[PDB]
Amino acid sequence: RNNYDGDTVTFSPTGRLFQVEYALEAIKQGSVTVGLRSNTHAVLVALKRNADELSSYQKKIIKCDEHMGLSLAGLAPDARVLSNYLRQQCNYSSLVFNRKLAVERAGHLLCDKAQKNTQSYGGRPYGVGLLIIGYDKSGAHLLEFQPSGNVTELYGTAIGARSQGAKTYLERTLDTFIKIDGNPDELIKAGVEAISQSLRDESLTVDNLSIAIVGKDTPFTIYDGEAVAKYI
Amino acid sequence: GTGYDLSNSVFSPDGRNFQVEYAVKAVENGTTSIGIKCNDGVVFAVEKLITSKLLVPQKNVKIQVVDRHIGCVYSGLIPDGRHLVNRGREEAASFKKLYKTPIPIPAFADRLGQYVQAHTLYNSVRPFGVSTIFGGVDKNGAHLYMLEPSGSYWGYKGAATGKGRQSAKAELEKLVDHHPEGLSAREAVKQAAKIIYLAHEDNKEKDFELEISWCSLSETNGLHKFVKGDLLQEAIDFAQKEIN
Amino acid sequence: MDIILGIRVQDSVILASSKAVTRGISVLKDSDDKTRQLSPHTLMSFAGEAGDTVQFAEYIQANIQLYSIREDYELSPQAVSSFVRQELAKSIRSRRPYQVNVLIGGYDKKKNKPELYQIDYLGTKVELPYGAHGYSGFYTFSLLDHHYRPDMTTEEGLDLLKLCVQELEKRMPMDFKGVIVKIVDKDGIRQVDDF
Amino acid sequence: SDPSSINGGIVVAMTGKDCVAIACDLRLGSQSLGVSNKFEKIFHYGHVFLGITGLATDVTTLNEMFRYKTNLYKLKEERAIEPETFTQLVSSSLYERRFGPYFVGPVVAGINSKSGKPFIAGFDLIGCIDEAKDFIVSGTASDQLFGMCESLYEPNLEPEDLFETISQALLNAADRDALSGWGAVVYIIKKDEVVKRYLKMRQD
Amino acid sequence: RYDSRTTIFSPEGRLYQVEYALESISHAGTAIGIMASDGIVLAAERKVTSTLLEQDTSTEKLYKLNDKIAVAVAGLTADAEILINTARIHAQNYLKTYNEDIPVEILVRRLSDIKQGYTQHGGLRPFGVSFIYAGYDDRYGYQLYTSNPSGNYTGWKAISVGANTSAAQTLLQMDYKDDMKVDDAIELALKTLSKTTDSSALTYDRLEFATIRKGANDGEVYQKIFKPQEIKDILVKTGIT
Amino acid sequence: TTIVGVKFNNGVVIAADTRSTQGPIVADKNCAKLHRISPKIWCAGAGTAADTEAVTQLIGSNIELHSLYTSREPRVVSALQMLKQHLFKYQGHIGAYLIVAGVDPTGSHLFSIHAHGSTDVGYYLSLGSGSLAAMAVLESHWKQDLTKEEAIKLASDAIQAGIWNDLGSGSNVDVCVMEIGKDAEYLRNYLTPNVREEKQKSYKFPRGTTAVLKESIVNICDIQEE
Amino acid sequence: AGYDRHITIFSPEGRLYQVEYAFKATNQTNINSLAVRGKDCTVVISQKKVPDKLLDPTTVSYIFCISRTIGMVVNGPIPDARNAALRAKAEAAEFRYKYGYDMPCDVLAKRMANLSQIYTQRAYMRPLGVILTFVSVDEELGPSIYKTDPAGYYVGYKATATGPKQQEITTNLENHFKKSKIDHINEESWEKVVEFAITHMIDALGTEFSKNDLEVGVATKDKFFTLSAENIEERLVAIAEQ
Amino acid sequence: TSIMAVTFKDGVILGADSRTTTGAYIANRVTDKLTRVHDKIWCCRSGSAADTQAIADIVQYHLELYTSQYGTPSTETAASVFKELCYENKDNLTAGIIVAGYDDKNKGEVYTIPLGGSVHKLPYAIAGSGSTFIYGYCDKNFRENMSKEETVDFIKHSLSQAIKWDGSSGGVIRMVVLTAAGVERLIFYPDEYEQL
Amino acid sequence: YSFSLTTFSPSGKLGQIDYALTAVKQGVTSLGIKATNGVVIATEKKSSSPLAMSETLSKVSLLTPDIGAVYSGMGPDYRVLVDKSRKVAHTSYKRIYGEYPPTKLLVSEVAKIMQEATQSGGVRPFGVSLLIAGHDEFNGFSLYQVDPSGSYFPWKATAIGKGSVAAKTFLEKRWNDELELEDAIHIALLTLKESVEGEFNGDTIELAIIGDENPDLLGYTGIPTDKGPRFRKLTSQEINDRLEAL
């Protein structure tokens, strides 16, 4: 049991919350996204979806800022809320200190955001995980957000549907993308390979890929259309 | 069982709150975290498990700082563990402004334990699910506490929490018997490491990472700072030597 | 400036009001309206501080008309006059004063007489059968009472009114451009034009 | 000068043997203009009489306010309020606004039903128990009425002899004051009987 | 389920809570208003009695809401107590603002709003009080109303609440005359009250009365609570003592 | 006015005039200016009469509530501090000046409160506008460890001296001896150097000297049921 | 049921089950407290428990200095002992300057009785699981003992005890006042009052204690102070040879 | 009205004149300006008597709540409390406060807080209106770590000079000596002090 | 159902008014008898161990200087409710009315505090039902009962607590229309000795009166225009005398 569901304020006999465990599933039910990075670049590749052939596809990249941006995997209504607070904290950093925000610092602010609802009576654990990419004074970084709120630095990771396969790819090719530096193309082309492994009963399509890369000398940029058709 | 949980502030005919005890059950499942009191400092050591080779180690810590002199390390659920240190950080900051002197280490134990307590007092909000070992060096010297998610805190010479807590306390038990003084600061770095080696024979599936931090009177200058380099290598060689 | 006249006769209350609305050092419009109905048998002339007059009139109009719908019958003059006095009493203790004086002239249909109240810009209600404010009450409290007899009619009170207008025209340095005279009786409210 | 002095009104009470008298003018003036000659300033709640002098807006506001409070008390307790308890009440009610007090000078006069004794008490702006058993005066001409009453007063008077004493005092003190006169009235409370006698005097 | 809070309605759009509040009314004794052309009598019957209960110098189910209008209480006196105070406040509020005493209709209509609101909004409970209102106004004459604890009202020429509701309504209407007099309203009041009361005797310690009269001089509306000694004589007259 | 505070060996005595003057007109010849806080704690009002009587009453109720709470008599300090934190909030926008004095099983205590929140402790105080007047006698005929008789006399002479120099005072002197272990003896009309003389001519006139326009009979009584 | 799970809902007996459960929570730190009054002192002793060796054994405390002259002993759980301490110290402090004099044993203990009752009237908060015993020497009532129960009840005492084995202690104190015919301790220096209280505890359980196994707080005229362990030691040997 | 505090080898001695002056009339000539706020810390008051009195009450209240909750406080801790009340309320209240206490781990210490509130460590401080006149007297005849008697005498002389050239300085010279042995109060009559 | 504060039962009323009423019934017997020149109010003490002091307990608490009260029911709720009555008595009606309130009036304000604690859900009614007896110049001496339900009744004599029913039948018999105040005390003692005998003696029985003013217990003298306190509490010795006299 499984009756201790419908409460986020009741610890189960094992000290887990069902609301958070069910939220990990919630991610899986959304779209796949792969993050990967070096010291010179950070990239998100995300699977777009259509539910009818009269759709022009739906983007899964939200621009946070002109050095940062983020992806979603899991519930889309949960996601929209999280990205609003996140945008705010980058605006603050610029305004008051004339500073740009670090990936890690932003993620510690989002880490807090989650836990407000988890303590209280009513509210939800979030059901979507974000991979945050940005470039600061400490280079490229890549963070993974959880329902719990837990934040983990990884040189490359994947969330979403059948994403365990993309992580296996990344694990094999671990050193390859850390060693690649100064080539934005090459981090992008590796990204294509990883998300191929994720796709089941499907293949890579141009109108499916959305690619976002931010770098040392590169501002945040979202490629789509006829700009991902040379990375097909 | 059934009855008098569902809420964390409903007693039973045995006087015991069930939900809260499951709070302690959450702390067991988290990682092996230990802290050692010395007569001139305190040393904090942690098992941060390596969950992949795609993880980036020694860049995600369960060490956090409070003021610039109080070390903290947590067991339990990781982001709950963030949240309670955050509270610590607001009190540190506020106290330092009003009285213009740092937070005393006994003063700190009292204040934290009370926020934990406002959340075990209401039926409506959940309790914390983390323990926090903490302490440092202040004007009244070194002092070390471990705060339970139950609402309780005590002084300790050596405090342990997490899964491998049965093994770590057994090693600490030698440390108190053998040195009544709590051991010198320098040897307690290499010691803090040894215990975590012998306590990861109960989380042996995965790989681990040892990160060490300390606060010592004449060697970290009454302030908290990370242990790195040659010192770190030595804590590793020492532990290694004696597990073998 | 901004004359308003009240005289109560034994079958009517005859209220009169200015048509000069002066905003600036320049009379903004020649001919206007400045007295409005609360109810079909209660009529409220107003003057006072500039701009406060339009807001205040409309507000009182709405309260009387609301109450009249709730009761399902028209409220007595007593009840209207004490309602108006309250709003000004409240305003003088508040941070926005309203410095508007009114006259309430209704015809009571439960008692069978005209009742004329004078409500001051302070907010004081006292019943008087020759009321007025401003620099109108300076010439007309004396003059209305001169030819005043206890037995009067609409016609005798009208002759007596027109006479007041002319006094004011003579000795005040303010062009009122004439007055509108509205008569209140048990047969409704009607405008009758006057010199 | 002060808002009370613009509008005017005086009230005077006096005591005789087992009686009290409370009396006033009828003149309501704002500035220099005379409005009325027939507005009283004396009220009553039960058998207890309240006169209020001062700024015309607070005389009207306080007539409604003290009418609302004494009736809620009466309805609740089902018996009459007394002069003794009301002396405490008036002061209390006045002290509430301190940073915008009511510009008034009340006089309470009455005879208790629990002893039969005559009782007076006086009040300023923000109110306090001012105890006399001689007489209390208030208003713009309180300074005229303090001297003229003291002289005319002889301690303990018949109800009919007391009518002369209050009347002759009030008349000439009002008259030689700008913003008082214009008709006056006397309420003579014997005990449970109140006679109201209108003074003939010069309308000014 | 549906026997739950106010906000929750029911498999038919009823509310089970209003019906349990109505039933609260008959756990306290019989109360009757009779309108007549020369005055209205309001009566209530005691809900408790003992030989050491002091009840001939007190009332507890006759309250003044002003100086023309009164109410008799049936039901919980603990629900009644808060509501009697609020009622009286509103009644003197019309005095203070408009310089006339309140109509009987407005005083009734406000309390329907107050009762209704505690049901409509929030999870707060309904009350359990039926007030019979007897008043005077110049435009409507003699006027009677009664209030359900539901938050609505009906005017009546005679009305009974309290214990033994059908029996009492039956006696009232049987001898109810359409001209009548006040002395005729007092006689019917006693007659109806006795039979309804489970104790065979009916005495002054079991009766409250107040009568609202205008036959007590014209131009003046005088509220007259009859004292204990006036109740004893009219019991002789009617045969009861 | 003029208020004196004089302590002694077994208690403390507060005395003040009964003349209440607001502006140049004496409002009341007799009115108590000695306000009771608590059974054997008293105070005296100077400055603004209105403010002094109102505040002492309101505050006095709280002290009464505290007595009940403690199962012991109030403290004189309990009165002083409560006053002090009330008058402070305003910052001098209530013109009250009081000498609080009283008895306790921990002694006899003497205090002044101020509008702004200021305070004085002595073994003699004087307060009002005739504070200057009273002071002179208080300094020049004081003794260490006064008796009960000696203090009653010293308080009365200092007020009598101030009647002559400070025109705020006159009339009667009221005195409250507050003695430890014993009742507080209210002695009103203690010293009275004033005298209300007889009339040189009696002022009376027969019924009907005043001219009557109309008369009427009004009722304050309920009408009969018939 | 619904209804011993509900803080403010009464059962079918009109009884409040929640209240009763606090009396069965108060022996969760397994300790007995003894306080008696001299005539110039009130002495408080509770046993110490230091069950784990990993503790720093000298930062174990049960006796709390609450204010300058006013101490408290807690029987019952640590999470509710701390909350009780914060409220009694806060309020103890607040009175002093508000009412401008030293605060009684009695006034403080009533105020906590009142505080606990409000917490149990309301459902948002719960009854605490500590039983509090206040100890002081008052400068207007002398030697005092007030035991405050977590139901919001309070009653005074001549001598008191608390704990799971309270009964043995109860019997020792009753037979002393039966024989002495007085309501205090006749020994008139507080040092001999310390010894006396020890002897009653040592006897009542049957086993002597150590100094790492007692803690003693001593209330003297307008004062409070907690004895260190080496002063405790002087007292135990005062037992061993007189 | 002048108040000052002088450090010495054994402690700190606080000195004051005891006159309370409203305008230029004396309320009470013996009401002292040295008021106890802790067991081992006393404070001095100048500016408006009212404004300073309330401010001390808050400080005193905090420091007693600090002694129970978080152990006993210091002069350093004691100073800062007054300063925040003074810094926030820096137009609502006018208060010059000298905070001088004794520790065993730092000895006697002196902090002065000016009218608008600022934190200053000085070895001796002088405040009031009489302090102005005696400023150069104190600079020259102050020594650090001096004998107990020369300290008594130095404060006794400096305040006696303030009485001489300021009309609200007088009363008696009262003194509070803070030491590890507790508190010793001393009093000096004009017949002793003024001749000198 | 019976079983929230919000919900009315299948045959009306609230079950929580009734549970509160049951709580009084486990209380310690109190009783009031109204005499014809006074009111006597009498109760018993029974507390804890023999170690406990019972002189540090008041179950007779003056609400005001003229009006005393007693309870039956929960001990703890009494002290908070006594605390709430004294404060309210002062605040609305000793400040805004400047002097000691009428008994009747205060009874009404007390009842409304009880009813407000049943009204708001998640707050239980009080465990206790009081007797409040006092005097004023407009209603006389009076005796009242205020139930936790929030309704009040005047009485000639009534009793509450465990001993209620046995006391009641004794009062019907021994009570009369007129009593003196002294006669009323012995009648009170006789009745209360039924609830407990073998623990009845005048040092363990707490008693007070609301009778005469007192000039020695006023605390000040020479003003006969105020009244000494109507309430006077009889000490241990005084009760012991009245019992030899019974």
Beta-strand pair A68-74/A61-62: antiparallel
> Choosing among H18, H19, H31, which should be mutated to test the F contact, i.e. which has the most F CBs within 10 A?
H31
From chain I residues 115-144, the ones with a CB under 8 A of any chain F CB are: none
- Return the closest-CA partner of residue G166 out of G9, G26, G14, G21: G26
Is B151 in the G-facing interface, judged by CB distances under 8 Å?
yes
Under 8 Å between Cβ of C122 and C88: yes
Task: Classify F7 as helix, strand or coil.
Answer: strand
C175, C1 contact by CB (below 8 A): no
- Asked if G148 and G133 count as a contact pair (C-beta separation under 8 A), the reply is yes
Q: How far is CA H73 from CA A112, G180, H102, H179, in A?
A: 35, 45, 11, 16
Distance CA F44, CA F64 (A): 18
What's the distance, CA H186 to chain centroid? Answer: 14
Dist CA H167 CA H155 (whole Å): 18
Chain I residues with CB-CB distance to G174 below 8 A: 49-51
Alpha helices in chain G, H assignment, sequence order: 17-20, 78-99, 105-121, 166-180, 190-205, 229-240
Residue with tokens 């309240």: D50
Read off the tokens for D133.
Answer: 């058993």
> Alpha-carbon distance A121 to A123, whole Å?
7
User: Which residue of chain G is at minimal alpha-carbon distance from H72?
Assistant: G68
Measured distance CA(E188)–CA(E7) in Å, rounded: 42
Which amino acid type is present at position I7? Answer: T
- In the numeric block, the tokens 């049957």 are attached to G206
User: Using CA atoms, how far apart are residues D200 and D180, in angstroms rounded to an integer?
Assistant: 15
Q: Coil, strand or helix: which one is F115?
A: coil
Q: What is the DSSP secondary structure assignment for residue D23, as one 8-state letter?
A: E
Among B137, B122, B201, CA closest to B167 = B201
Distance, first Cα to last Cα, chain I: 50
From chain H residues 19-48, the ones with a CB under 8 A of any chain F CB are: 20, 22, 25, 27-28, 30-31, 48
**F35 at I interface, C-beta within 8 A:** no
Bridge-based pairing of strands I39-44 and I30-34 is: antiparallel
> Which one of H1, H21, H52, H112 is the catalytic residue?
H1
Nearest CA in chain C to E137: C110
What residues does B214 pair with on adjacent strands?
B43, B225
Q: What is the CATH number of domain H1-196?
A: 3.60.20.10
Sequence-distant (≥ 6) Cβ neighbours of residue H143 within 8 angstroms: H150
Q: What are phi and psi of H14, to 5 degrees?
A: -100, 135
Q: Give the amino acid at D110.
A: G
Question: Cα–Cα distance between F73 and F82 in angstroms, integer?
Answer: 16
- Structure-token pair, residue B29: 């499942």
Q: Beta partners for G215?
A: G46
Helix (H) or strand (E) holding C23: none
Touching subunits of I (3+ CB pairs, under 8 Å) are D, E, F, G
- Out of F71, F78, F105, the one facing G100 most closely (by C-beta) is F78
Q: How many CA atoms lie within 13 A of I218 on its CB side?
A: 20
Cβ–Cβ contact I3 with G under 8 A? yes
Which are the contacts of B60, defined by CB distance < 8 A and separation ≥ 6?
A: A151, A152, A153, B48
- Determine phi and psi for G105, rounding to 5 degrees: -65, -45
Count of all residues that appear for chain E in the document:
241
E52/I168 touch (CB, cutoff 8 Å), yes or no: yes
Minimum distance, in Å, between the CA of residue C4 and any CA atom of chain E: 24
Separation between Cα atoms, residue G95 and residue D17, nearest integer Å: 53
Q: Is I222 exposed, middle or buried (0-12, 13-18, 19+ CB in 10 A)?
A: exposed
Q: Which two tokens stand for residue E136?
A: 């005077």
Strand partners, A159: A33
Chains that touch D (3 or more CB pairs under 8 A): C, E, F, I
Amino acid at F217: I
- A160, B15, B179, D145, H123 from G59: Cα distances, Å: 51, 26, 18, 81, 37
Q: How far apart are CA F68 and CA F223, in angstroms?
A: 47
Query: Over I161-230, what HEC string results?
Result: CCCHHHHHHHHHHHCCCCCCHHHHHHHHHHHHHHHCCCCCCCCCEEEEEECCCCCCCCCEECCCCCCCCC
Q: From CA A57, how far away is CA A38, in angstroms rounded?
A: 30
Name which of B55, B79, B125 is nearest A120 (Cβ-Cβ). Answer: B125
Start-to-end CA distance of chain C, whole Å, equals: 18
Which residues of chain H have a CB within 8 Å of the CB of F116? 48, 50-51
User: What CA–CA distances, in Å, run from D25 to D9, E128, G154?
Assistant: 6, 53, 65
Residues of B in contact with A115 (CB under 8 A): 79-80, 82-83
Q: Which residues pair with G33 in a beta bridge?
A: G46, G162
Edge-to-edge strands, sheet with C113-119: C35-39, C42-48, C100-108, C113-119, C125-127
Element (H, E) at A105: helix A103-119
Nearest residue in chain D measured CA to CA from I226: D84
Tokens representing F140? 């020049």
Residues I225, G67: Cα–Cα separation, whole Å: 45
Q: How far is residue E61 from each of residues E70, E71, E80, measured CA to CA in Å?
A: 10, 8, 9
- Only one residue has tokens 């209960």, namely E53
| DSSP, res D54 | B
Q: Which of H21, H20, H92 is nearest to H51 (CA)?
A: H92
Q: Which residues are registered as beta bridge partners of G73?
A: G63, G133
Q: Which of C4, C2, C18, C13 is nearest to C119 (CA)?
A: C4
Q: Which residues lie closer than 8 Å to B56 by C-beta, 6 or more apart?
A: A153, A154, A155
Residue pair A204/A70 in contact (Cβ under 8 Å)? The answer is no
Cα(H17)–Cα(I21) distance, integer angstroms: 67
Q: Which residues pair with H177 in a beta bridge?
A: H13, H184
Chain C residue closest to D102 (CA)?
A: C93
Number of H helices, E strands in chain H: 5, 12
Homologous superfamily of domain range B1-244? Aminohydrolase, N-terminal nucleophile (Ntn) domain (3.60.20.10)
- Count contacts between D and E (CB, < 8 Å): 25
Touching C: which chains, 3+ CB pairs < 8 A? D, E
Fold of D1-204: Glutamine Phosphoribosylpyrophosphate, subunit 1, domain 1 (3.60.20)
Resolution in Å, one decimal place? 4.9
DSSP designation for E53: B
For residue G104, give how far its alpha carbon lies from the nearest alpha carbon of chain F (Å): 8
> How many C-alpha atoms does G43 have within 13 Å on its Cβ side?
26
Residues in a beta bridge with D48: D45
Interface contact G91, partner H, CB < 8 A: no
Element (H, E) at F119: strand F119-120
- Does G87 touch chain H if contact means CB atoms closer than 8 Å? no
Give yes or no for a contact between E62 and E208, defined as CB atoms under 8 angstroms apart.
Answer: yes
Contacts 24+ apart (CB under 8 A), A83-87: A83/A130, A85/A109, A85/A110, A85/A113, A86/A110, A86/A132
Q: Cα(first)–Cα(last) distance of chain F, in Å? A: 59
Element (H, E) at H141: helix H135-141
Are the beta carbons of F185 and I222 separated by less than 8 Å? yes
F105 touches chain D (CB under 8 A): no
CA B227 from chain centre, in angstroms, equals: 16
B37-63 residues labelled b (16+ CB within 10 A) or e (exposed): bbebbbbbbbbbbeebebbebeebebb
Domain segments of chain H: what residues? 1-196
How many C-beta atoms surround the C-beta of residue I137 within 10 A?
A: 14
Give strand pairing partners of I75. none
Whether the upstream peptide bond of residue A2 has omega within 30° of 0, thus cis, is: yes
Cα gap H32→E231, rounded to integer Å: 76
Contact (CB<8Å) A10/B129: no
Give me the residue label for tokens 């409390």.
H81
Q: Note whether G touches I: 3 CB pairs or more under 8 A.
A: yes
Alpha-carbon gap: F184 to the closest alpha carbon of chain G (Å): 22
Method: cryo-EM
Phi-psi region of A128 (alpha: psi -120 to 50; beta: other; left: phi over 0): beta
Q: Which residues pair with F184 in a beta bridge?
A: F178, I220
Q: Helix or strand or coil: residue A194?
A: helix
* Parallel/antiparallel/unpaired status of strands H173-179 and D194-199: unpaired
d(CA C42, CA C64): 9
Q: Considering only CA atoms, which of I115, I157, I155, I82 is closest in space to residue I16?
A: I115
- In single-letter form, the type of residue at position H137 comes to Y
I199 CB contacts (<8 Å, ≥6 apart)?
I44, I46
Catalytic-residue membership of B132: no
Q: Which of E87, E74, E79, E69 is nearest to E32 (CA)?
A: E74
Query: Could F184 and I95 be called an inter-chain contact, meaning their C-beta atoms sit closer than 8 Å?
Result: no
Contact B70, B224 (CB under 8 A): yes
Yes or no: say if I115 and E81 are a contact pair by the CB < 8 Å rule: yes
| Other beta carbons within 10 Å of C70 | 11
Instruction: Classify residue C51 as exposed, middle or buried by CB count within 10 Å of its CB (0-12, 13-18, 19+).
Output: exposed
What's the CA gap between B158 and B167, in Å, rounded? 13
Structure token pair of residue D29: 């003036």
Q: Which residues of D touch C126 (CB under 8 A)?
A: 28, 35-36, 39
- How far apart are alpha carbons F75 and F39 in whole angstroms? 11
Question: Whose CA is closest to B133, among B182, B62, B219, B61?
Answer: B62
Between CA C176 and CA A163 the distance in angstroms is 88
Shortest CA distance from A12: residue in chain B: B22
Q: Is F182 on the interface with I (CB under 8 A)?
A: no
> Which residue in D165, D188, D170, D169 sits closest to D180, CA to CA?
D170
Query: What is the C-alpha separation between B26 and A41, in angstroms, rounded?
Result: 38
Please say whether the beta carbons of E29 and E198 come within 8 A.
no
Measure the CA–CA gap between E72 and E122, rounded to whole angstroms: 29
DSSP C144: H
Cα–Cα separations (whole angstroms), residue C69 to C62, C65, C74: 11, 6, 8
**Residues of chain I positioned with their CB less than 8 A from the CB of F184:** 219-221
- Report the distance separating Cα B196 and Cα B73, nearest Å: 14
Q: F153-157: long-range contacts (C-beta < 8 A, 24 or more apart)? A: F154/F6, F155/F4, F155/F6, F155/F13, F155/F15, F156/F15, F156/F190, F156/F191
CA F147 to chain centre: 23
Determine whether E191 is exposed, middle or buried from the number of CB atoms within 10 Å of its CB (0-12, 13-18, 19+): middle
H-helix segments, chain E: 16-23, 77-98, 104-120, 165-174, 182-196, 228-238
CA dihedral B111, B113, B119, B121 (to 10 degrees): -100
Q: Give the distance between the most distant pair of CA atoms in chain E.
A: 57
Chain I contact for F183 (CB, 8 A cutoff): yes
| Identity of the residue in B100, B104, B110 whose CB atom sits nearest the CB atom of H119 | B100
Cα distance between residue F148 and residue F135, in whole Å: 20
Q: What is the DSSP string of E167-222?
A: HHHHHHHHS--SS--HHHHHHHHHHHHHHHSSSS---GGGEEEEEEESSSSTT--E
The tokens describing H4, both together, are 């000052």
D53 touches chain F (CB under 8 A): no
> How far away is chain D from the Cα of F192, in angstroms, using its nearest Cα?
18
Q: Where are the beta strands (DSSP E) in chain D?
A: 10-16, 19-25, 28-30, 33-36, 42-45, 48-51, 107-111, 118-122, 130-132, 135-139, 184-189, 194-199
* Contact partners, residue E167, CB within 8 Å, separation at least 6: E195, E196
Q: Breaks in chain G follow which residues, C to N over 2.5 Å? A: none
Instruction: Give residues with Cβ within 8 angstroms of H91, minimum separation 6.
Output: none
Cα–Cα distance between C14 and C5 in angstroms, integer? Answer: 8
The SS3 assignment for A31 reads: coil
* Subunits adjacent to chain H (3 or more Cβ pairs under 8 Å): B, F, G
Q: Among positive and negative, which fits the CA dihedral G96, G97, G98, G99?
A: positive
- Return the SS3 of I80: helix
Q: Among G118, G146, G174, select the one facing I80 at the smallest CB separation.
A: G118
Which residue(s) pair with A37 in the sheet? A42
